[PDB]
Amino acid sequence: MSKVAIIGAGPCGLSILRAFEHLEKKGEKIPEIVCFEKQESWGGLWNYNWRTGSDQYGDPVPNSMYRYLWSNGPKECLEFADYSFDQHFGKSIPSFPPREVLQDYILGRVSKGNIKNKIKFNTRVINTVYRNDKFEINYQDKVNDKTLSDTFDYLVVSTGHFSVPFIPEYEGMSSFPGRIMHSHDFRDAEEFRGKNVIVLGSSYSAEDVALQCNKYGAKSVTIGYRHNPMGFKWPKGMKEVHYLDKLDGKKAIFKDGTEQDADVVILCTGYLHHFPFLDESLKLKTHNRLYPPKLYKGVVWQDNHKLLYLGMQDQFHTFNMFDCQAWFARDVIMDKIKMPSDDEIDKDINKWVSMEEKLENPDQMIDFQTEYTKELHNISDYPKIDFELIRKHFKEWEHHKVEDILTYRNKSFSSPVTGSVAPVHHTPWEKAMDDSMKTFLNKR
Amino acid sequence: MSKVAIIGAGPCGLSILRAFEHLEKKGEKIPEIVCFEKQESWGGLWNYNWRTGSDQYGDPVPNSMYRYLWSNGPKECLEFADYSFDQHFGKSIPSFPPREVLQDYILGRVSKGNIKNKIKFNTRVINTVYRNDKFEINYQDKVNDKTLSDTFDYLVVSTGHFSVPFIPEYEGMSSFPGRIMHSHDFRDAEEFRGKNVIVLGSSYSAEDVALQCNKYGAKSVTIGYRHNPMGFKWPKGMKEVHYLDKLDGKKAIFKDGTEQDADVVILCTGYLHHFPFLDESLKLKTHNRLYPPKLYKGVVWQDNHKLLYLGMQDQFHTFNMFDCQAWFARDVIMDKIKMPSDDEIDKDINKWVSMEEKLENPDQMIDFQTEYTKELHNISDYPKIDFELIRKHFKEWEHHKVEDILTYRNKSFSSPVTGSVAPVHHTPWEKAMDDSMKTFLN
Numbered sequence: 076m077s078k079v080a081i082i083g084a085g086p087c088g089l090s091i092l093r094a095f096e097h098l099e100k101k102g103e104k105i106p107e108i109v110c111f112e113k114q115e116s117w118g119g120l121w122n123y124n125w126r127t128g129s130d131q132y133g134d135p136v137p138n139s140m141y142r143y144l145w146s147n148g149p150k151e152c153l154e155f156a157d158y159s160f161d162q163h164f165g166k167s168i169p170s171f172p173p174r175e176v177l178q179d180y181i182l183g184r185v186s187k188g189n190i191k192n193k194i195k196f197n198t199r200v201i202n203t204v205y206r207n208d209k210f211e212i213n214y215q216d217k218v219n220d221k222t223l224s225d226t227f228d229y230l231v232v233s234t235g236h237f238s239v240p241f242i243p244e245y246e247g248m249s250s251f252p253g254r255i256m257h258s259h260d261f262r263d264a265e266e267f268r269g270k271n272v273i274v275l276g277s278s279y280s281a282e283d284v285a286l287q288c289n290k291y292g293a294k295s296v297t298i299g300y301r302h303n304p305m306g307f308k309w310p311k312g313m314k315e316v317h318y319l320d321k322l323d324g325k326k327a328i329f330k331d332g333t334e335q336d337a338d339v340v341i342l343c344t345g346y347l348h349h350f351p352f353l354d355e356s357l358k359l360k361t362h363n364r365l366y367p368p369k370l371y372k373g374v375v376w377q378d379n380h381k382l383l384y385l386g387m388q389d390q391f392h393t394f395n396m397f398d399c400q401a402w403f404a405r406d407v408i409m410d411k412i413k414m415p416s417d418d419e420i421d422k423d424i425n426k427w428v429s430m431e432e433k434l435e436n437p438d439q440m441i442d443f444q445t446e447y448t449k450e451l452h453n454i455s456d457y458p459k460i461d462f463e464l465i466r467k468h469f470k471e472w473e474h475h476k477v478e479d480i481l482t483y484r485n486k487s488f489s490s491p492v493t494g495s496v497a498p499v500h501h502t503p504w505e506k507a508m509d510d511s512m513k514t515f516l517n518k519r
Numbered sequence: 520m521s522k523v524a525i526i527g528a529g530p531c532g533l534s535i536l537r538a539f540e541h542l543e544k545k546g547e548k549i550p551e552i553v554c555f556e557k558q559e560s561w562g563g564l565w566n567y568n569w570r571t572g573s574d575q576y577g578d579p580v581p582n583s584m585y586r587y588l589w590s591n592g593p594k595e596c597l598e599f600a601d602y603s604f605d606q607h608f609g610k611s612i613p614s615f616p617p618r619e620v621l622q623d624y625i626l627g628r629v630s631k632g633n634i635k636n637k638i639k640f641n642t643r644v645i646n647t648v649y650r651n652d653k654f655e656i657n658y659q660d661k662v663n664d665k666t667l668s669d670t671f672d673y674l675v676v677s678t679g680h681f682s683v684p685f686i687p688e689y690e691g692m693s694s695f696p697g698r699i700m701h702s703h704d705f706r707d708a709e710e711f712r713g714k715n716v717i718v719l720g721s722s723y724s725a726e727d728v729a730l731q732c733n734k735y736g737a738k739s740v741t742i743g744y745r746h747n748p749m750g751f752k753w754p755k756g757m758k759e760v761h762y763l764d765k766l767d768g769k770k771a772i773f774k775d776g777t778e779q780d781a782d783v784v785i786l787c788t789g790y791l792h793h794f795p796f797l798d799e800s801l802k803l804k805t806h807n808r809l810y811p812p813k814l815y816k817g818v819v820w821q822d823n824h825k826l827l828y829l830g831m832q833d834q835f836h837t838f839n840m841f842d843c844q845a846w847f848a849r850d851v852i853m854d855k856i857k858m859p860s861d862d863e864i865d866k867d868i869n870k871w872v873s874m875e876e877k878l879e880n881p882d883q884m885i886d887f888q889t890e891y892t893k894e895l896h897n898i899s900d901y902p903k904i905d906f907e908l909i910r911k912h913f914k915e916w917e918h919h920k921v922e923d924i925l926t927y928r929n930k931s932f933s934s935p936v937t938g939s940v941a942p943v944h945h946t947p948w949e950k951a952m953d954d955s956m957k958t959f960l961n
């Protein structure tokens with residue numbers, strides 16, 4: 076009899092819609108659910124959008140994915156327990172597919188039934204306050220340029236945290252004559268063919284963007300790190316150096332003495348958790364990390380147990396962790412799972428936060444999120460999936476990347492759901508210039 | 520004894536701060552004024568910012584100007600009546616200065632007294648409702664990432680309307696192997712040297728972005744128009760063609776059949792009046808036009824006479840029109856100017872809107888905004904300035920542009936404030952690669 080709002084229809088919002096659909100299909104009555112999505116269609120980050128900055132309605136563009144993007148982790152690590160790769164594709168496919176393939180899989184899971192009709196598209200939530208036991212929500216109908224309002228018993232926030240970029244200033248940028256952009260702006264790497272590219276950062280975006288620039292013909296790619304190099308085996312035309320000091324006209328000067336002519340600077344400097352549409356009292360505030368505090372089981376807002384955040388952690392696991400989070404949130408909403416005492420909640424948060432702060436390397440992090448996700452898995456009825464296999468997969472994958480960053484996407488992993496072994500793709504990733512699902516799924 | 524909020528510290532916000540300063544210097548008591556500015560410094564669009572999109576705080580970047588930008592109208596048409604070019608610069612200088620020079624002029628006017636201390640920078644107004652005879656305003660202290668709140672008797676919205684881009688989709692963009700950007704994203708034309716540039720639009724941004732790209736070595740520049748070409752005398756390697764149909768790889772295809780190699784598409788397609796920080800009941804909704812309705816004298820919000828908008832009209836006049844609006848707004852706030860009846864307000868709006876809807880060419884438009892500005896001028900005490908001369912200047916300028924779009928900036932105009940005749944700059948604009956204030960001053 077309650078009414079539930081979901082903000083965002085990407086993997087997380089879809090996860091919980093799907094979780095609810097499971098109950099409805101079994102004949103259980105479920106709450107009225109309204110899902111708000113600022114994009115014109117579902118899929119979240121998995122939708123490619125040529126647009127950058129802000130859209131035709133002045134709404135910031137949430138899309139960060141670029142042309143030629145391929146899965147950067149084993150697809151087997153992100154398989155849906157309730158909708159296997161085998162079921163969706165009707166056959167085994169390689170472990171690292173291009174974006175369109177995974178998008179098709181994501182949307183395939185939810186496109187059979189009534190989920191889509193629950194989503195309001197081109198609709199942007201803009202204000203949220205909790206009053207008299209309800210979330211009062213204002214949202215802009217963008218096409219009509221009109222503010223609407225409604226009231227909900229539960230609010231699920233699933234707006235991700237890789238859309239609003241963090242963009243630091245470096246000396247000399249105000250006089251730089253080339254392009255300065257953030258990875259969030261990166262669209263078609265062909266833009267930089269024949270150009271000298273600087274990328275700043277040391278995580279997945281710096282890694283992949285640098286590779287894409289080289290793959291699509293950049294004259295050179297120079298990666299600057301502040302703390303430690305990524306240290307991967309970069310191919311010719313790429314180097315990694317310590318810390319941009321300044322841009323001096325067309326010249327990038329680093330603290331280790333390196334000087335490099337630069338045509339473009341790409342800041343792969345991460346993203347903000349950004350919730351302008353939430354009251355200060357409801358608003359999660361954190362940097363990107365495996366376990367922000369104030370989130371019971373990493374989902375329930377400590378100070379308001381009817382506000383639930385999905386997907387807000389930094390990510391090794393993704394789709395099936397979102398699922399475990401969503402099933403949990405569903406069950407909290409349905410009063411299947413009961414909230415422990417304030418003291419126990421706080422103690423449990425501190426237990427995980429304390430573990431999280433001591434993590435020293437990717438192996439410990441993988442183990443951490445594995446245990447986090449498995450604990451969630453055990454408190455609801457999300458179907459069988461082998462998180463122990465996924466643990467090993469992630470570790471093997473990390474070793475592949477250090478072995479050879481160019482070929483890790485050529486490796487094969489087994490499904491933690493069906494056991495199916497992924498075949499080796501008909502094209503090595505380092506040579507695969509065509510990123511279409513058609514080219515991928517069909518014979519060479 | 521009232522309290523006044525101003526949103527924005529560009530030319531318009533500075534205009535009204537300056538207007539209040541004039542009274543304060545004379546010894547008149549003025550209301551407490553708080554000015555909110557999302558940038559870290561004052562100057563509005565006249566500040567160059569390398570940033571695009573949104574800033575380190577996730578706040579959309581309001582800056583739209585690029586490097587090596589030169590003023591595109593005669594400076595004499597935008598001179599401050601209360602702070603002349605001669606006074607600020609101490610000598611006559613050419614009529615079309617680089618951005619920094621006019622920025623220096625704008626900030627010079629307000630730099631001498633206590634105005635800057637009234638401004639909160641890195642502060643973004645986010646919510647506004649009118650309740651119990653007051654504007655309740657929420658603003659983000661961006662550095663601290665904290666929402667703050669205050670209440671004001673009067674609210675002046677001076678946030679411009681050339682910051683939030685209107686960005687239309689064309690077929691083929693989803694697969695175009697090159698950059699697609701809006702003019703709002705344009706920063707340094709050198710980015711596009713040796714490139715085949717497509718520019719879409721038919722107004723000032725299209726015009727200047729096209730010329731800038733050509734000036735800075737674009738391999739070619741092709742301008743698409745939807746309705747009518749600008750029709751200027753474009754140099755070798757530039758053309759205007761009708762209506763983009765689709766991009767097909769590195770190829771722009773127009774409805775008039777032309778196929779053009781395209782490396783970058785620059786949408787010079789205008790901007791939104793965008794006021795997410797205002798309650799629906801307070802929010803001006805309009806396209807870019809010389810006289811939007813619901814604004815008495817183009818300033819006072821018809822449904823709330825304590826809400827005043829500045830600079831929201833499309834613009835031939837700029838600085839001194841903002842001044843005339845600001846002086847008016849100030850006098851309304853100070854209760855020196857009294858609001859006529861609801862029916863007289865409605866009639867007055869209808870009178871101007873009806874004239875505005877009938878304007879058919881730049882000459883009629885220049886005449887219209889001249890009369891709009893002069894009427895404003897006559898109801899407050901903004902100092903003497905020759906709007907009749909300005910009217911003539913604009914028309915002459917329009918003729919220069921049609922005669923030769925490459926040399927209109929090499930022309931001289933006389934000050935409507937002091938009569939000083941501007942020297943012709945020592946370098947024709949086309950070869951003017953040194954846009955430094957130093958080099959411009961002599």
Ligand SMILES: Cc1cc2nc3c(=O)[nH]c(=O)nc-3n(C[C@H](O)[C@H](O)[C@H](O)COP(=O)(O)OP(=O)(O)OC[C@H]3O[C@@H](n4cnc5c(N)ncnc54)[C@H](O)[C@@H]3O)c2cc1C
Nearest residue numbers: 083085086087113119120146147199200234235237386393
């Ligand atoms: C460049 C890049 C590459 C990646 N590659 C991979 C990969 O290969 N494999 C992998 O497993 N993971 C990858 N990820 C991780 C990615 O975060 C997750 O796969 C997934 O997209 C997270 O889903 P989400 O629903 O939590 O957030 P999102 O996917 O960001 O979805 C959030 C949705 O909420 C909407 N929204 C936001 N604000 C509002 C509002 N105010 N009102 C209404 N709607 C709103 C947005 O439009 C968006 O659709 C990648 C991330 C990035 C940035």
Ligand SMILES: Cc1cc2nc3c(=O)[nH]c(=O)nc-3n(C[C@H](O)[C@H](O)[C@H](O)COP(=O)(O)OP(=O)(O)OC[C@H]3O[C@@H](n4cnc5c(N)ncnc54)[C@H](O)[C@@H]3O)c2cc1C
Nearest residue numbers: 527529530531557563564590591643644678679681830837
């Ligand atoms: C590319 C370009 C070139 C131009 N060239 C010329 C020229 O050569 N000559 C000429 O006369 N005119 C020119 N103009 C016209 C220009 O509009 C005016 O010169 C002038 O900048 C308008 O001033 P304004 O104060 O009304 O708005 P702006 O200059 O835009 O100032 C608005 C200010 O409000 C701030 N703001 C916005 N939203 C918020 C918020 N929510 N909270 C707090 N602060 C906020 C912004 O940071 C900004 O500083 C040009 C415009 C553009 C876009």
Ligand SMILES: NC(=O)c1ccc[n+]([C@@H]2O[C@H](COP(=O)([O-])OP(=O)(O)OC[C@H]3O[C@@H](n4cnc5c(N)ncnc54)[C@H](OP(=O)(O)O)[C@@H]3O)[C@@H](O)[C@H]2O)c1
Nearest residue numbers: 145147243275276277278279280283301302343344345363
């Ligand atoms: N191939 C793909 O499919 C693909 C491609 C791109 C992104 N992604 C996804 O995108 C998500 C986000 O990854 P991300 O790397 O964008 O964000 P991130 O993991 O949060 O990393 C942010 C990076 O920015 C650096 N940084 C922070 N401040 C800086 C400054 N002032 N100057 C220079 N560097 C600075 C940080 O390193 P220091 O603090 O040491 O400088 C850090 O390496 C990931 O989930 C990833 O899976 C996937």
Ligand SMILES: NC(=O)c1ccc[n+]([C@@H]2O[C@H](COP(=O)([O-])OP(=O)(O)OC[C@H]3O[C@@H](n4cnc5c(N)ncnc54)[C@H](OP(=O)(O)O)[C@@H]3O)[C@@H](O)[C@H]2O)c1
Nearest residue numbers: 589591687719720721722723724727745746787788789807
């Ligand atoms: N040198 C300089 O100092 C300089 C340089 C650039 C800009 N500026 C300033 O910028 C300000 C604003 O000018 P502006 O031209 O950006 O905005 P504008 O004057 O509002 O013009 C918007 C243009 O976009 C076109 N347009 C609208 N929808 C379109 C679509 N779907 N596809 C293609 N075109 C479309 C319009 O023509 P159609 O509707 O006919 O297509 C119109 O020509 C001016 O005040 C000017 O002073 C100054």
